[model samples]
Target: EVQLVESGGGLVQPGGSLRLSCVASGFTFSRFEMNWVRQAPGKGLEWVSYISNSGETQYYADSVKGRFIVSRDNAKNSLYLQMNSLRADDTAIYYCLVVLDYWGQGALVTVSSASTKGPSVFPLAPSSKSTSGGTAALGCLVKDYFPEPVTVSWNSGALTSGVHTFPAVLQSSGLYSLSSVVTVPSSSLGTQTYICNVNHKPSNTKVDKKVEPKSC
Candidate 1:
């Protein structure tokens, strides 16, 4: 039943600082040494830092010595890794380990130079007119955003089923793109207006596009 929950991972601009935390449970926090490790995209694992069980000693890798700090909060049963002066190369999934046994679900951090861009949402009309008692399929495209992770939702009064979303794809320009489709009953298509909502967190942008059913 041992578990370690990690938090504080997301987009970080170059030269920014970040603090990641791991909350331990089902075990004594100060009884086991904790370690911090990271793996860059397509790269091997790299040790970053570790804190002694007693919280009296610490060690950091030479590559991150000056910019990384490892500490613990015994009362809260948590361990923290504070990183400063982040760079593009620091983009990686960071993991917290207790005595090399229990591991926290890693957190992905991205350090990018390009500014966050709001996604442009385009709602496409239904692929084809649906016959009576049939279903109609429609789609939405979200493009040109920096950093990964975007949300797409459809709004049309309690419309929640038959929704399909694709993974975000990185483009050659370092931006991200995503697409989603929804299938609704043909009988309601002509009477309802479907709205596609795209939310890009880093940019604090939300765009909505409305699609009206075409006449048969």
Candidate 2:
């Protein structure tokens, strides 16, 4: 089991620079190789750079040459990438890959001069099933978000007894989908509302769905 977490995302002005970091755990850092790959919105994947725990580095894509630098921090078990003189086209989702297999969630970088595209959030009608006496299971599906890592949250107004969230999943199309559920007593359905809130951090955009039980 390996886990890679990415961070350092924000908007950079034209000709500005940006740096991203991918930290790993659950495995020995020096025992594997990590690479940076990116995909522009609706475009195919592009390899940026590669680095090994021993500090060896290689540039896999000439397009990023001279502008991108990949480095490793053995002390912290982290991989870092920095790109200078960014343009609108530089905005894309960057993923950290390990052992040519495992990957961290994508981190979206945006250029302030670029046109922003916020994620499309859709709330599905929940499907319910009785799991035990007087209690039922309710699930809400949130789908079709873009540019990597969209936050999906669920809230059961007033009737919230508890909730468990399923981790978000990334599709091959480079978009994201998430499923979450809240547990409540069957008798409380008539007066409660289940709300799903989604936020696209790259663009600072948010959308929510308030589903009244009456509409269920």
Candidate 3:
């Protein structure tokens, strides 16, 4: 009784860009570590973190900055969260989790067109290979998240508030995917872009990527 295959009404355009997907299958995915949660319907559930299967990540609350971005492709275990400049309160309704108990079931994304281009962290995939000094980490995946329960950050730009990595997630499917592998030292190759954030319930949510670096 666990499934989250997202997509059910979309048309982004307020600053442009928006993508969504969270196709999950039966649990026990190596004993849990797959989670993402966003809510805006009587609100209370915005952990947003967790994705382990060798693609390590964990971020917990920053109100999902810029917009949003969460991804997973453990060879087709399929999980995704793409969001970009879509004002209208960003149009609520996004949940893809493995735990955080309240109802134990979620999957639905909504955003009806509105782009003017000027907001990112939604749909992470922009590579040229060179993440100067990379090897940073963060994580998330919660169960019964509440009052002052927050911590997960891996940052270089966008939002980490005051960068200081190391915050792992995974407590019997408390679910949080945290990553921080910082080492792309080649004169800051290609500027920056590597973030995983959260603050708690629609709380500072964030997702970013840029590591086209690897050549020994």
Candidate 4:
């Protein structure tokens, strides 16, 4: 069975909300959760939330529960996101985020510019270099996509924010991509969950890479 996937490239007029699509091939839908992620113009990634096949929803990093929602069609095995109240500020690249980094291709959406971010490079399995756990800056680089997801946040031992940015190309994919860096402190940053947010289409996905900050 194939994992879920998404269509890339996005377009929207100012003050317009979009309902992007994700297509899954060869896989058990119930085994996975859906996530929505976003990277703004010249910024990092913002992981939206997670939704189960039963339609369970959770958001991270000051995100309102209603601003983003996740749902699916049992018959179609497809997930979806409906971003309403479209405004100039809501413009960015929306992605159908997946946890365990089980990612598919994403779609890019912008206002006047309609720029394209390049493909996403899945990072190596993040591990604590020193179990002593002082502090580490996990690097997130999406060289082909824009509106990159943020990688840093205050919620340690819980879900936190991720740092994101747009970078020039070194290779060639014929599109633009933004990369963001997040510094997760070893000490607990309050809150109960530290989340990394990524908003794309289909559904927003936030993964919990929680760790209590340890005094170094």
Candidate 5:
């Protein structure tokens, strides 16, 4: 019967700070830990920080190590995450985890600037020399993404030789780059278009790019 609520969604200027709130009800607030978690555009989930039922606190991820401050008010059954000196890529959806047992709905915030780029997918030239099955490795380059773990997938007529994903790596701009490939058997090659599906939950939409096998 416990309920968790999160608020303070807004647009934050680059280089400014943001504060989000989470309140718990229908249960004793002091009996659970309140943790802050975030997901940036096209990136994976990140643990911001946590305050225990006993008032102890700890950070779980490096991204927010020095800039994130977590606090709680037992009497008000409320928890807060204060993100300081933010950047454009700091735009994301944040939520509260109640003792690893419950989660509040995500609240989105955007740190906007002229140079901010969200998730994008670029088609890479296909390769046909990898396998004798006339297998062609179809890949797309995903760049200017945020957070760390971005989900890359394919939409072929069928699952192509299991998706091969290169690890997402940090770029010079502090954004992320990821590559995902789907190998199609020679028999499957044709004019059909295979779409690369990129999910970046932080921006509120799924991105997709299509490539025709004939381009191989």
Candidate 6:
């Protein structure tokens, strides 16, 4: 029942600072070390900082040497990451790790100086041009979004399994693009319609598109 809940994810302007927290439960907080890891949109993971169990020894990566601070409060069973001098390239999802086994649900912090843009969801289409009746794959593309936290779902909630989504790729235009795919029984393709829904939180916008087997 060990748990690590993360918070403090939101928008931050360039040069601004942010503090992220991870509250721990179901274990002895002071007996274990904590580490911080981060991953930028569409990028690989990177280690940021680490603090010893006693909160005495601390180590940080060269990239965040001077701007990132990792600390903890045993009394409150909390771990913290204080980041400074943020930049657009610093935008990423930060995660707190206990020792090496337990991890917190990452917090996404977007560092930007421009305005937010709502996403544009395109129509759903079959991955292949023709299919006979076993399984069908459909893809939905979402483009031109900013601040990078978007949710893509199929049938609004009807089809949960066989749904695969790619990471948001940052476009040269300073926007983001991604795609989601859903697989279903081929027989259901023509018998029922499928919908791809995209929700952009920052702009409070939602867009959906529908497609049928014949459309392929």
Best by lDDT: 6
- Each candidate: RMSD: 8.1, 10.4, 20.0, 17.5, 7.6, 7.3
Query: Taking the tens digit of each residue's C-alpha lDDT, what string does model 4 give over 1-216?
Result: 456666534656545566766776677775777777777656787776577766665554355355645576656878777665454555566667555456655566654343433344443223444423565554444434443333333333243354434444422223444444556554423333333333333224333333333434
Candidate 1 C-alpha error for residue 32, in Å: 0.6
Where does model 6 exceed 4 Å of error?
A: 117-168, 171-174, 177-216
Q: Estimate, for each residue in 1-216, the C-alpha lDDT of model 6 and write its tens digit.
A: 889999988888888999999999989999999998999877899989999999999999999899989999998999999999987777889999999888888999888766788988876666444456578888788988987799988888988899999988876455788999888877676577789888999999999878655443
lDDT of 5 at 71: 87
Which residue pairs clash in candidate 5?
Answer: 42-200, 44-149
lDDT for 60 (candidate 2): 59
lDDT of 5: 0.75
- In order, what lDDT does every prediction score? 0.84, 0.72, 0.47, 0.52, 0.75, 0.85
lDDT: worst 10-residue window of model 2: 124-133
Instruction: Give Cα distance to truth, residue 181, candidate 3, Å.
Output: 55
Q: Taking the tens digit of each residue's C-alpha lDDT, what string does model 3 give over 1-216? A: 666676643544456666766666666444456666667544565665556655566564565664666667766766666666655444556666654532234544444342121112222222334333453222223222322234444453445443454454322212233333333334444455544444443444333333343343
- Can you write out model 1's per-residue Cα lDDT over 1-93, one digit (the tens) per residue? 889998999988778989999999988778899999998766799999989998899999999989989999999999999999998778889
* TM-score versus the correct structure, for each prediction: 0.56, 0.53, 0.20, 0.45, 0.54, 0.60
Model 2: residue 80 alpha-carbon error in angstroms: 0.2
lDDT of 5 by residue, 1-216 (tens): 878898887877678898898988988998887888888867898877888887775665677778878988898999888889888667779989888778888898877543434687888756544434666677789988765457777883355556798888655355678898876765555545678888876655578888654333
Model 4 is weakest, by summed lDDT over 10 consecutive residues, at: 201-210
lDDT of 5 at 60: 55
Clashes of each: 0, 0, 73, 70, 2, 0
